[PDB]
C-alpha cells in the first residue's frame, strides 16, 4: 500500500474542517513558485487554509463522499485543470484582500 496511507491521509484533512469552514469558491493558479505559495500561507496562518493536490484523486475521495456531506449533490464539476484549494470562514470582501499580490508575473 504505502502511498495509499498518504492517499487516504490526503483524504483525511481533505474534509474535517470542511464543514467547519464556509462555502468556498474557485482558487485558480498557474506558473506559481514554491516561495510564492509559502508566503501566501503566512498571510493566512489562521486567516484561511492552503490545501493543494492533484485533480482526479481530489474528486474520487470526495466525489463519493456524497454520503457524509451529500449537500453538494453537484458541487464537484468545477475542479478543472490546475486547481488548488484555499479555505476560509469570513466574508467575500475579506477574501482577495488577503491573497492576490505576491506577483512575479512578467512577459
Amino acid at each position: 500500500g504505502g502511498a495509499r496511507e498518504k492517499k487516504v491521509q490526503y483524504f483525511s484533512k481533505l474534509r474535517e474542517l470542511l464543514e467547519e469552514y464556509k462555502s468556498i469558491f474557485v482558487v485558480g493558479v498557474d506558473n506559481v513558485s514554491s516561495q510564492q505559495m509559502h508566503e501566501i500561507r503566512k498571510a493566512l496562518r489562521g486567516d484561511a487554509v492552503v490545501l493543494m493536490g492533484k485533480n482526479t484523486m481530489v474528486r474520487r475521495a470526495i466525489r463519493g463522499f456524497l454520503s457524509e456531506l451529500p449537500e453538494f449533490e453537484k458541487l464537484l464539476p468545477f475542479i478543472k485543470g490546475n486547481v488548488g484549494f484555499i479555505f476560509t470562514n469570513g466574508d467575500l470582501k475579506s477574501i482577495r484582500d488577503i491573497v492576490v499580490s505576491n506577483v512575479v508575473a512578467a512577459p
Partner: protein, 63 residues
Amino acid sequence: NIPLDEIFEIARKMQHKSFGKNLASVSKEILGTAQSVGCRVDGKNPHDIIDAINAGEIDVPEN
C-alpha cells in the same frame, strides 16, 4: 547542552525563517541545521532532541 532558555529567543530572533505553522517550528528548523556539523547540542547530536520534540517530549507552547 546549550539548549538553555535563550535558544527559544533565536526563534523570535530569527523569526523570519521557517514559516512553520507554530513558532516552535522555528526552533525545530533552527535546530534542524544545528546538527550540520553536530556539537554540544543538548549534550548530544540533533535528530534525537528535535525528532523527539516533534514526537512530544516536554512541552513549550510559547504563546
